[PDB]
């Protein structure tokens with residue numbers, strides 16, 4: 001009676017696989033693989049998908065389906081960033097994947113991904129009352145409102161940690177004024193999503209890094225993190241810490257901080273901070289499950 005499923009997310013830089021199955025009522029992850037192909041390389045400036053990248057990605061996709069079929073998972077979905085939509089060869093690519101790897105890839109919007117992530121949260125955390133999943137990412141953050149497995153509304157804010165960090169922070173670490181204009185802005189933009197909620201669930205690399213931080217979880221374990229709480233205080237404690245030091249010292253002194261995140265992580269912490277303010281809340285619940293797991297959730 002056991003049914004196994006798998007999901008494959010083709011990101012702008014990574015490709016991920018996740019096969020799982022359902023006993024009676026429980027769903028569990030049996031494997032998680034991921035490889036960097038950087039399929040998104042120079043897409044914006046060239047309006048093209050580099051052939052070698054496409055080549056590298058396709059090989060991995062096959063490498064992946066080898067496992068899918070292996071576990072004979074009778075249900076497989078594959079999605080891709082819409083970022084690749086700016087490439088003329090985007091459809092051509094999608095085509096090749098179809099016959100060369102025998103795989104149907106659905107490009108999805110930043111809102112759709114929000115919807116998927118939200119679903120992963122409804123199953124892994126079973127939130128109560130009105131819930132708002134806040135998925136802060138590198139390109140942008142999505143606020144997803146709903147009840148149970150029902151999605152009310154999804155709003156996607158252009159507030160990408162990278163550009164947001166390039167704009168307001170001109171020094172590493174930044175100056176007090178900079179941090180101030182940063183929050184004025186955050187305020188303006190965030191007041192737009194303000195809605196009455198009961199439980200705010202936190203998502204993304206920044207906030208799970210923050211949990212590991214707060215709970216002294218070094219070798220990353222997604223059980224000592226998932227479902228953990230993060231009061232406004234614990235969060236403000238760490239914003240304060242980092243703000244006082246340059247991206248590098250954060251990387252050096254704190255093992256859970258990925259060099260790639262080390263810098264931008266300030267603004268990321270900021271968003272979560274100001275959000276609790278606007279939504280007037282003392283804390284939020286952190287989730288290790290997101291898009292990749294949310295896709296599987298759908299059945």
Ligand SMILES: Nc1nc2c(ncn2[C@@H]2O[C@H](COP(=O)(O)OP(=O)(O)O)[C@@H](OP(=O)(O)OP(=O)(O)O)[C@H]2O)c(=O)[nH]1
Nearest residue numbers: 010011012013014015036081136137138203204205206290
């Ligand atoms: N370890 C590692 N991870 C990488 C690297 N590059 C990207 N990632 C992770 O993979 C996702 C971003 O790239 P993709 O896989 O292409 O996904 P995407 O195009 O939809 O953004 C994010 O995972 P995420 O945490 O689920 O989303 P996020 O909130 O950080 O954005 C990001 O942190 C890398 O070089 N090393």
